[PDB]
C-alpha cells in the first residue's frame, strides 16, 4: 500500500487572486446541493469551475457545517452512503450470477468495512444506534 493524497498548502488566508465574494460561494454550494450533489462533488465542482481552493478556507467553515446551517444536511454520512450502495450493487451482481466467489470474498470485505465505520458512527452517534445495515 502506498500514498496518493493531496497536500493542502500552508496558506490559510487563501488565495488573494479570488475576486469573488464569500456569499456567492455559499449560494453556489446550496445551488449544487439542492441540485442533489454529494459534499465531495459540490466541493470538486466549485473547486474547478468557480475556482475556490477549498471552501473551509474561503468560507470560515466546512461544507458539511454549512449544509447543516442551511438545512440541507444528509441523513447518513457520505462514506457510509457510498459504501452501502456499493454493497447493494455487488449483492445484486452476485444475486444475478451466484458462482462468483471472488465477488463473495469482496462482499465479505465490503460488509466488514461497513461494520467498522458503522460502529464508529454508533459510538459518536451521528446516526442513532439500533442501526444495523438499513
Amino acid at each position: 500500500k502506498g500514498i496518493s493524497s493531496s497536500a493542502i498548502p500552508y496558506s490559510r488566508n487563501a488565495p488573494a487572486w479570488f475576486k469573488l465574494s464569500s456569499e456567492s460561494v455559499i449560494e453556489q454550494i446550496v445551488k449544487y446541493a439542492r441540485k442533489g450533489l454529494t459534499p465531495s462533488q459540490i466541493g470538486v465542482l466549485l473547486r474547478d469551475a468557480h475556482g475556490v481552493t477549498q471552501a473551509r478556507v474561503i468560507t470560515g467553515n466546512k461544507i458539511m457545517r454549512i449544509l447543516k446551517s442551511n438545512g440541507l444536511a444528509p441523513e447518513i454520512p457520505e462514506d457510509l452512503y457510498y459504501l452501502i450502495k456499493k454493497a447493494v450493487s455487488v449483492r445484486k451482481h452476485l444475486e444475478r450470477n451466484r458462482k462468483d466467489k471472488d465477488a463473495k470474498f469482496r462482499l465479505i470485505l465490503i460488509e466488514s468495512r461497513i461494520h467498522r465505520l458503522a460502529r464508529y458512527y454508533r459510538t459518536v452517534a451521528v446516526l442513532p444506534p439500533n442501526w444495523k445495515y438499513e
Binding site: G36, P74, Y81
Partner: peptide, 22 residues
C-alpha cells in the same frame, strides 16, 4: 449527471410524501 435520488433529508421528505401518497 451524477445527481442523487437519495442521501438528503429533503429527499427523505419527498420520499415520505411518495410513500404516503402511494
Amino acid at each position: 449527471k451524477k445527481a442523487k435520488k437519495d442521501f438528503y433529508r429533503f429527499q427523505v421528505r419527498e420520499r415520505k410524501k411518495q410513500e404516503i401518497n402511494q
